[PDB]
Amino acid sequence: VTRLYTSYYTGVLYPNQLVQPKQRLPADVSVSAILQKRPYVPLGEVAKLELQGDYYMEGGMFQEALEHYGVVAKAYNYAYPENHAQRIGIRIKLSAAFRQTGRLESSLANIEEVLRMLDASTRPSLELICEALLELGITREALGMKREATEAYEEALEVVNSFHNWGESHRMLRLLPRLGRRFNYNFEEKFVYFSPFDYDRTFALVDQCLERAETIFNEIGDVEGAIRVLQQRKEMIDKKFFNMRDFAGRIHTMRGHWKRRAQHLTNAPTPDELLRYSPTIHQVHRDFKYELTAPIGREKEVMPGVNRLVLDMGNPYRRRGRLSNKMLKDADHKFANYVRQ
Amino acid sequence: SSIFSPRYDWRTSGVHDIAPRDEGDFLYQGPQHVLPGAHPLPLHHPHNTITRPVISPYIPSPQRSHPYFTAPLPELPHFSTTKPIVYTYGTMKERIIAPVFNLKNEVIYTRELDPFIFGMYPEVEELSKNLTYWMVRCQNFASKWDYETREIWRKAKKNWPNTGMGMPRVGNRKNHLYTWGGRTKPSKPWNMLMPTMDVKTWSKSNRMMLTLKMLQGRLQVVDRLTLEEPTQECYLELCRNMSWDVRHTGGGVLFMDGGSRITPSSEFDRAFFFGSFFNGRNKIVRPTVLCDEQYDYNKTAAKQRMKGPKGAKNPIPINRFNAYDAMKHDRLVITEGALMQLEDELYEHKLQILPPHIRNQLPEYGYLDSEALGDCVPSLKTIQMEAAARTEEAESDMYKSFIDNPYNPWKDNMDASYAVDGADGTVQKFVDGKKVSWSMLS
Amino acid sequence: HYRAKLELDRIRSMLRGRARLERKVGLKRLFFLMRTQTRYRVEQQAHWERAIVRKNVDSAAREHGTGWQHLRNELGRQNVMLLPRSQQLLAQYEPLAFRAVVELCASRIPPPPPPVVASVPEESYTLWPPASLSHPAARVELRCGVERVLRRGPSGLGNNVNELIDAWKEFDVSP
Amino acid sequence: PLFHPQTTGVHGGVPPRQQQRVMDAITWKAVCFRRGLLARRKGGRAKFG
Amino acid sequence: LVKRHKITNNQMLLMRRREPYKPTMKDRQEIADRAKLEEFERKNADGLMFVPEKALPPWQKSLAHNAKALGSRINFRGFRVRVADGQDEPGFPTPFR
Amino acid sequence: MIKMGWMKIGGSWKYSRGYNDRRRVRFMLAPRVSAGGPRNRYEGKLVFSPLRLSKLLWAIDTGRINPNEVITLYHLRQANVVGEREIVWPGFVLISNGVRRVPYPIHIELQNASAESIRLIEEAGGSFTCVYMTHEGLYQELHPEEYPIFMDQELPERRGLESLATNPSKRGWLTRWYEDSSKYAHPAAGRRYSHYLKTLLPWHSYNT
Amino acid sequence: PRPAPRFAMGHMLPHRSNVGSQFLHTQRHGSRSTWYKKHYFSLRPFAIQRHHGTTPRILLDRSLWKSLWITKLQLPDINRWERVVNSRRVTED
Amino acid sequence: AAAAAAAAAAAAAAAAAAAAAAAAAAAAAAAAAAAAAAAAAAAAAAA
Amino acid sequence: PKMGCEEITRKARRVQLQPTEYLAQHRMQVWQLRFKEMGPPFSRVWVALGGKMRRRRVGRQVDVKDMRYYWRPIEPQYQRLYMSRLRIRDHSNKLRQPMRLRATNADIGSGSSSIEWERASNRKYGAMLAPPKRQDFEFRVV
RNA sequence: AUAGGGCAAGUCCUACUCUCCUUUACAAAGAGAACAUUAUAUGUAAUUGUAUGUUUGAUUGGGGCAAUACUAUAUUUAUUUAUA
RNA sequence: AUUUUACCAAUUAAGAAGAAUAUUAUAAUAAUGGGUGUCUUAUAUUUUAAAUAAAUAUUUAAAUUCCGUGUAGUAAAUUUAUUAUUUGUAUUAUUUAUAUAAUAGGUGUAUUAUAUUUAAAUUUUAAAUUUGUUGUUUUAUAUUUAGAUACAUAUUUAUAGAUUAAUAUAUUUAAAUAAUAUUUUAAAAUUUAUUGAACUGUAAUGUUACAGUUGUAUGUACCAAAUAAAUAUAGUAAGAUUAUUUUAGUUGA
Numbered sequence A: 001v002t003r004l005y006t007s008y009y010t011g012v013l014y015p016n017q018l019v020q021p022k023q024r025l026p027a028d029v030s031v032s033a034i035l036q037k038r039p040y041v042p043l044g045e046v047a048k049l050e051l052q053g054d055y056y057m058e059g060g061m062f063q064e065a066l067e068h069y070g071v072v073a074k075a076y077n078y079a080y081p082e083n084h085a086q087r088i089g090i091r092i093k094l095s096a097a098f099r100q101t102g103r104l105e106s107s108l109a110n111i112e113e114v115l116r117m118l119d120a121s122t123r124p125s126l127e128l129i130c131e132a133l134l135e136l137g138i139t140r141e142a143l144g145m146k147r148e149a150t151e152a153y154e155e156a157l158e159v160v161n162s163f164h165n166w167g168e169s170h171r172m173l174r175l176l177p178r179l180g181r182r183f184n185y186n187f188e189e190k191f192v193y194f195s196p197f198d199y200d201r202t203f204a205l206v207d208q209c210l211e212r213a214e215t216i217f218n219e220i221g222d223v224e225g226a227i228r229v230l231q232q233r234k235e236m237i238d239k240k241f242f243n244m245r246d247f248a249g250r251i252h253t254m255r256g257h258w259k260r261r262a263q264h265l266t267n268a269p270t271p272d273e274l275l276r277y278s279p280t281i282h283q284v285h286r287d288f289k290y291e292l293t294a295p296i297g298r299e300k301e302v303m304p305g306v307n308r309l310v311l312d313m314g315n316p317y318r319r320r321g322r323l324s325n326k327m328l329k330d331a332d333h334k335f336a337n338y339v340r341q
Numbered sequence B: 001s002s003i004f005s006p007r008y009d010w011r012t013s014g015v016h017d018i019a020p021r022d023e024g025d026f027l028y029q030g031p032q033h034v035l036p037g038a039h040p041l042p043l044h045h046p047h048n049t050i051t052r053p054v055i056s057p058y059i060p061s062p063q064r065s066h067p068y069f070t071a072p073l074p075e076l077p078h079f080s081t082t083k084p085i086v087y088t089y090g091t092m093k094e095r096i097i098a099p100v101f102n103l104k105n106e107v108i109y110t111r112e113l114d115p116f117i118f119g120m121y122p123e124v125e126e127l128s129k130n131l132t133y134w135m136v137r138c139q140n141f142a143s144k145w146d147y148e149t150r151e152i153w154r155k156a157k158k159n160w161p162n163t164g165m166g167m168p169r170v171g172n173r174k175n176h177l178y179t180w181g182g183r184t185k186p187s188k189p190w191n192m193l194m195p196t197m198d199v200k201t202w203s204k205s206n207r208m209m210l211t212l213k214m215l216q217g218r219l220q221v222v223d224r225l226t227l228e229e230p231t232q233e234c235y236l237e238l239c240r241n242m243s244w245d246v247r248h249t250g251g252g253v254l255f256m257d258g259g260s261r262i263t264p265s266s267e268f269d270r271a272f273f274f275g276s277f278f279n280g281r282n283k284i285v286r287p288t289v290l291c292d293e294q295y296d297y298n299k300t301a302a303k304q305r306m307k308g309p310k311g312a313k314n315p316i317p318i319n320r321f322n323a324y325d326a327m328k329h330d331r332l333v334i335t336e337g338a339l340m341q342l343e344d345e346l347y348e349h350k351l352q353i354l355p356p357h358i359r360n361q362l363p364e365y366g367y368l369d370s371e372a373l374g375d376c377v378p379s380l381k382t383i384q385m386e387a388a389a390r391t392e393e394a395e396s397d398m399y400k401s402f403i404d405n406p407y408n409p410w411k412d413n414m415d416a417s418y419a420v421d422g423a424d425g426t427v428q429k430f431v432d433g434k435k436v437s438w439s440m441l442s
Numbered sequence C: 001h002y003r004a005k006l007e008l009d010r011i012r013s014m015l016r017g018r019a020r021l022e023r024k025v026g027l028k029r030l031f032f033l034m035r036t037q038t039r040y041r042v043e044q045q046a047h048w049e050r051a052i053v054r055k056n057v058d059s060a061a062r063e064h065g066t067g068w069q070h071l072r073n074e075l076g077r078q079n080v081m082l083l084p085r086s087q088q089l090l091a092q093y094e095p096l097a098f099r100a101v102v103e104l105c106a107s108r109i110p111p112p113p114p115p116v117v118a119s120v121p122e123e124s125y126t127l128w129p130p131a132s133l134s135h136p137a138a139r140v141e142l143r144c145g146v147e148r149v150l151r152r153g154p155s156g157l158g159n160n161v162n163e164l165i166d167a168w169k170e171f172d173v174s175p
Numbered sequence D: 001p002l003f004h005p006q007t008t009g010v011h012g013g014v015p016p017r018q019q020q021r022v023m024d025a026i027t028w029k030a031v032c033f034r035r036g037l038l039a040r041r042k043g044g045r046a047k048f049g
Numbered sequence E: 001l002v003k004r005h006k007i008t009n010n011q012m013l014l015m016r017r018r019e020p021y022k023p024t025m026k027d028r029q030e031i032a033d034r035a036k037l038e039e040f041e042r043k044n045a046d047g048l049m050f051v052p053e054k055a056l057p058p059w060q061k062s063l064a065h066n067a068k069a070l071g072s073r074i075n076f077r078g079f080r081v082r083v084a085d086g087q088d089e090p091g092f093p094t095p096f097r
Numbered sequence F: 001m002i003k004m005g006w007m008k009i010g011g012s013w014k015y016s017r018g019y020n021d022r023r024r025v026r027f028m029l030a031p032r033v034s035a036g037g038p039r040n041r042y043e044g045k046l047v048f049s050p051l052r053l054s055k056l057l058w059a060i061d062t063g064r065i066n067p068n069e070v071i072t073l074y075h076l077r078q079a080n081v082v083g084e085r086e087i088v089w090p091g092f093v094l095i096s097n098g099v100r101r102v103p104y105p106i107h108i109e110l111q112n113a114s115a116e117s118i119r120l121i122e123e124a125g126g127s128f129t130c131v132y133m134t135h136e137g138l139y140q141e142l143h144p145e146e147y148p149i150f151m152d153q154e155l156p157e158r159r160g161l162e163s164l165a166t167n168p169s170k171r172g173w174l175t176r177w178y179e180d181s182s183k184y185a186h187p188a189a190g191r192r193y194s195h196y197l198k199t200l201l202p203w204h205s206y207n208t
Numbered sequence G: 001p002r003p004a005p006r007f008a009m010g011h012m013l014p015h016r017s018n019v020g021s022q023f024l025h026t027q028r029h030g031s032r033s034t035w036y037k038k039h040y041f042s043l044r045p046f047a048i049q050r051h052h053g054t055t056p057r058i059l060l061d062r063s064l065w066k067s068l069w070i071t072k073l074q075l076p077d078i079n080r081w082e083r084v085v086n087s088r089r090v091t092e093d
Numbered sequence H: 001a002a003a004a005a006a007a008a009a010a011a012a013a014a015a016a017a018a019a020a021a022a023a024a025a026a027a028a029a030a031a032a033a034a035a036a037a038a039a040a041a042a043a044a045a046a047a
Numbered sequence I: 001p002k003m004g005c006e007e008i009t010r011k012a013r014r015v016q017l018q019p020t021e022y023l024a025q026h027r028m029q030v031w032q033l034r035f036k037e038m039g040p041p042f043s044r045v046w047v048a049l050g051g052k053m054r055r056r057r058v059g060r061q062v063d064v065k066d067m068r069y070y071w072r073p074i075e076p077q078y079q080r081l082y083m084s085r086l087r088i089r090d091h092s093n094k095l096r097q098p099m100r101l102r103a104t105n106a107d108i109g110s111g112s113s114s115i116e117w118e119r120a121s122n123r124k125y126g127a128m129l130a131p132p133k134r135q136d137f138e139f140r141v142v
Numbered sequence J: 001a002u003a004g005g006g007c008a009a010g011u012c013c014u015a016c017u018c019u020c021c022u023u024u025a026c027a028a029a030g031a032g033a034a035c036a037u038u039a040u041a042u043g044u045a046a047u048u049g050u051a052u053g054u055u056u057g058a059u060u061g062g063g064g065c066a067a068u069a070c071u072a073u074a075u076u077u078a079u080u081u082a083u084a
Numbered sequence K: 001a002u003u004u005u006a007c008c009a010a011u012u013a014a015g016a017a018g019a020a021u022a023u024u025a026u027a028a029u030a031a032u033g034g035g036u037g038u039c040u041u042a043u044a045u046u047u048u049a050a051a052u053a054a055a056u057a058u059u060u061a062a063a064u065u066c067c068g069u070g071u072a073g074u075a076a077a078u079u080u081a082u083u084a085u086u087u088g089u090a091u092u093a094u095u096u097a098u099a100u101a102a103u104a105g106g107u108g109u110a111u112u113a114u115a116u117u118u119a120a121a122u123u124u125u126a127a128a129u130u131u132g133u134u135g136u137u138u139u140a141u142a143u144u145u146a147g148a149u150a151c152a153u154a155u156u157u158a159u160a161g162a163u164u165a166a167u168a169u170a171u172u173u174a175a176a177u178a179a180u181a182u183u184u185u186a187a188a189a190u191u192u193a194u195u196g197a198a199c200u201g202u203a204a205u206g207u208u209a210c211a212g213u214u215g216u217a218u219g220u221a222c223c224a225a226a227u228a229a230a231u232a233u234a235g236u237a238a239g240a241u242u243a244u245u246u247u248a249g250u251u252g253a
């Protein structure tokens, strides 16, 4: 049959709907160091206001966006504790609204306070700090500090490169093409594609920041800076694609074998994780206390026994007969001499 | 069971005794705690360098295309390859240089390795082809015999009428329905299959497996594999000195004996071959990766009394190098003679694989200097090949005064004159008016 | 052919005599029982249960002078969305609340007016720009949103709609 | 209705299973009658007479 | 057997035909025949083009080539072999004739 | 199953009988054109395997065939431009499939060739000889190793003499012999002698 | 040329079924695929191994290679427990 | 598919539009005869 | 069976390797005579003569112009049946193209090309196809 | 007493076939007589037997095709054919 | 003084060599019929014949022909050879037994419809057969076990047309050369070879003689007999056919 969807249709569950945990900067690093290198509140209504403000931003009604963000920031400041992710995020949005409206000094002050709050916080969101750096760069560019805006863009680039996982976004989205079992029809599932620009917002933020840095370099007339920033952007996209890459399994139609879905969708390691933690670079700790067989030199570090004696090498032919056993009398002695000391 | 079946979780208690053991059971302190065996990747064999150490200059990191040396370091007398190296499709395009050990476990020099042999990047499909062929070929087909209805030894006569008795209509009850009965189409050795392998696929898969071992760092080049005495105690002492774990649960060693650099041999060294017969896991294989073109004379059931599986009648011998043995045995040991023989036997195949716009350049760069034409002094060969060549040289004298001279055949092919005899309906040769052709007998 | 052999042999202990003793008889009986219970659940259990709930609500209505028919129609008219299960629960455990609902239905209290349709403010038709400021329609919408925010609950943001609307001036910095 | 009209010429339009039961009963009766007849013709005992 | 289908509502249980908006078998045959006839008439709207020798089916091309082989090797205009397997005469004038 | 597709091994066998029927395992209205049928490969029929002139030129260009030598079926086989599957008697026929010119002279000896291919070779300046052979001749050419002496080569059959061996159009190698007259004149001149138009020890002595 | 059949590998000896291959080696007539499965409800023996398909590298008394289970041979001393430690047959209490 | 869909639409239109046909005696459809509109004894009020 | 069965205790019979069928068993002479296949490899059709295949009395059919020599493809159903009879030789290998109605040079020479026949010099390069060799000057059969 | 315990069966009329009988035809035995060649055979074998198998699907028919194209002329015509 | 209602419950850990010079295939070197508790006597203990057979054959062509029942020396004494109780339990793999038994003293009801304890409701075989889809037909006591074969996949050495009836012609694009298989149970069967006259039926005077193209209704308790061998167009008889949680087109042409 064919479906018209004239009536309500429940969206089908799909692996792309996994709740992805946002990347968080480590707890042993300082954003300030990098730079220098609950009361009840109708959060539903304030979220409605924030969404309306985002729509105004997209529509170019920057004054209205700023007005809505003012109320949203007031509510978040009252509700959440100091140095909170929601508070810093709404301050980022408010700074963007101020910059778009024209209050460049106000936007600069707000983004500076955002950076201060990020420094004060612990384990700040990588995406959030990248967006804050992008907003600071745009504000500096508007002020006319092209060099400082480019410096902010480069700082965001290095931060993401040093504290971002480029494969985690498509960990569960890389083996989706293997689900498809039909080739003549419904083969769009064999080529299902998920855009990194949509499934990794940090990547999109950094891409935009590098594009702006390249534009600033071109305006200034610099060549080396533009070349390096464009090359780094290309390398970033290459990392994302590489992590997204995979070969093709069954191509033509497959009947049955629906239980293969469990194999198809798993915690399949991404290329980056595989290369990082290959069995040899990231060695496996093997404690012989819980193991029987141990290397020749460490034969004494084996799981302890009450009172054990070595019988023989376990030669299966021993059971057969007198001559068969006689053909192996010295095997145990020779093995003992081999393993001596 | 199946993950989706209710049986997968129908058991909800009793699996674990809530009281832990007082011997080794511990708690999870936190992320700082290093747990044995824990690893983010699904390692079905979670070994480390301590368990099964790798014999290579470097641990095979992703930063390095291969654990072995990439340049001829000046600390050692680097040796080039026996034959010139041409990078064919599938080769790593990188220089492979590995250190050569001696019987004392200490490096003596370094040696170049041919990318076509140890540089062909492995591919799982080809490796699986090789593994499946080996697994199917290494069965005991003689033990796959089962009885048959016509072999059940029961009277050939209806045991009772169709309707008279009152039981199901059964006559000559030799059928599978009865416990004593047999099968209409049972399994027989002559009905089983022995797959036919192609020389090309076999060579490609074996070289891929060698490259896989090289990448994993399990490869080791040894100058010689000779023992002082042909006993087993000497072999065990050599293994101990070289740090070879030939125990049944140590990792294992595969040996391509061949020969030394100066005297490659196709036959196993006598003393080492005698002393290598040890219970522990340790395999000795020939220095070749090719295989004789398999054939099947009984490709159809022409010989009804053939008590052998359908398919190739020339299966790969057991001692031949194979993916199964390469995977089972942890470390691989290859001698200089083995490397020489491999390069010698694969040079022609590599050159033939090369495309034409490079084939034409081969002689220009000097990769086709034929010793037969005097272009270069004769190349080094195994003991047996050199002996055969010397025998040929000595015997070449007698082919001098005879017309059937293999070295100089049809010497008078030009000065002779060809005539056509219509009456005889033939064509004949004449030299100075004498008929030189031969009227073939029939 | 698959049958729930292993799954049903487990509960085979719940039968009597021959079925509980002999595997085949018990498995057949359990298979039949499972299938019949499935059919009953999917085609008669809901009908029986909701008929029972209907009868309980009807008996409560009769005791209060009404009946299920008029009670249901008047609940629909008054727009009181109490499912029959909820009505039964209220009648059994909160007789005073059920009587209050019946009194509401009986009384000539005007039922709630129908939902309103979205109204376009005159500010939308107001020209902008007339020939740094905000669109009057957007300002009206923001005021309505702030009013909803304040009326949703006793939040500490304050009841001053103008103060909330002027919030962005708090974060603004004078040049 | 007939069993398999396409094979009525072979099985009389009756299921062989029903035919199998009918022939089983009739063959039992016929075997008993034949044993009795042999006994009568040979002197009360088939093998012996 | 009957192809059972996963239901999405009791209306699918009540449904007998999987595709109610599809003509029954006889109407399908009628519609297919009408469509094929219309397509054939559209194809034949123009006359019957007299395709050359090389365009004839495999079982006429070689026969015609062999029939006219001698004329091909000795070139002179006005040589036509009246073969039998060639395309049949339409009976009316056509643009390609 | 025939009418239901792939069914699980579990059950549901009742509605499948054609499957079991297949498991247990018009011409009369058409006339016979000839006793042996159309395109009958009767013994002695000249059914040549194609040899694309384009393929031969590609082999020459790549370098598997030396232009400086007179190409023969043995040379083609050794160069591996043809496989043993397509070496059946009478042999190969040269076909000019998609070739308009031959840039350089080529000297070939095949068992037959098309008029267009012969014309192209001659125009380019090479030569072609239709070396029609019997089975013995073909085998000897492909395996000269087995014949240390020039075994008497039987002349082809009457069909070969008429069609290829003595055909000026095909450059038959017996055209000259057929055209000769002394062989008809006297038995002594029956055969006319023809001649070609006018170490190998791998071990050498090392010299410094 | 044709890749060797993956079912011909000795990794499975299934019970004869309706679907198979002329070269598919199924279990003999009157024999069960899994040796310990005398009955569908029988359990897998614990610590008793039946080596199958090849000659074992290490053979324990408690295991089976080509004989049956007899206490006096499979269990010489009941109080002793055999195991494989450092590629040797080692017995503890 | 376009031709088949057009033919199906035409067949549906033909089989669903002309619900009833005027009696042949009054006017023969096969002879191209048609009946005009007789509004003599009609009314204008919206009855 | 079971080990303690006299059926297997005694030796009744033993079966050999069952003989195989002729490779071209299903290539039928009736087809080889009536029909002939022609066309591209994936669009080849079998054709047969078209006309009245009947014998009349002496004076019935007079105008030979009515009877003309031409080929028309056989019915696709019968062509499918015959191609199936050609396919059934090797069913597992979907990659193997159906057998040809009339053997060609490659099909005839493949057998000789195989190694076991590669050594057999008497059957290589169309030995049977080629005309007979000339017999000896003196030949006797007694 | 009911169910279970094999049963589309009984009579009657029509139609067709089988069994059976017979001979002058058909196939076909075996056997034998006679014949040719010089007490045992070979080669033919129209008699006989008829043991035996058959002996109501006729489209292996009927129709239509009839050298003398083309351009042209003449005669005749059962009232528009016929012939060169 | 007297006395404890009726009914209703359940299978599991196995005590001991009560399982191996074992079961099947596997050895290409022996061999005048193996017969112990045997143990003179040889008119009386003779099996030979130019044939498809205990000797067993590497391909698709052509070809007789009313469904083409089909392929040659590969090396010439050349190693494809009919093997064989131990100088490895011979080796390698494979298969394997139902001897054996305290189990509980009462969760549901007690005027009748059926497991899940709040009482009710629901409930009253399965498989095949039946295409007029059944109320037709057949099978199933239960426990455990035995029980049925269409290769879901082709990595560099590498090279692949057509076409005429025939001669002949050949302007003119591909390709992973691979074969061996094909449910299962069951036909009134027929064929080959052999025995039976102690039953029965004759002739002879209990015994002898005559036997399955057949002796005199019968020929040893199924006369289209009995015994031994066999897998016939098993097809246009029938039955059975081992893998749940599924993921796409038409329901009488």
Ligand SMILES: NC(=O)c1ccc[n+]([C@@H]2O[C@H](COP(=O)([O-])OP(=O)(O)OC[C@H]3O[C@@H](n4cnc5c(N)ncnc54)[C@H](O)[C@@H]3O)[C@@H](O)[C@H]2O)c1
Residues within 6 Å of the ligand: B404, B438, B439, B440, B441, B442, F146, F147, F148
């Ligand atoms: N006759 C054929 O059909 C045929 C087929 C293929 C190859 N050949 C080759 O032709 C040549 C002669 O064949 P033929 O049939 O005319 O005679 P032939 O085969 O009957 O040979 C007869 C004698 O010639 C000897 N002989 C053969 N080759 C010899 C050689 N190189 N050196 C010394 N003695 C040799 C043989 O030992 C033998 O004694 C052989 O070399 C053969 O390889 C012949």
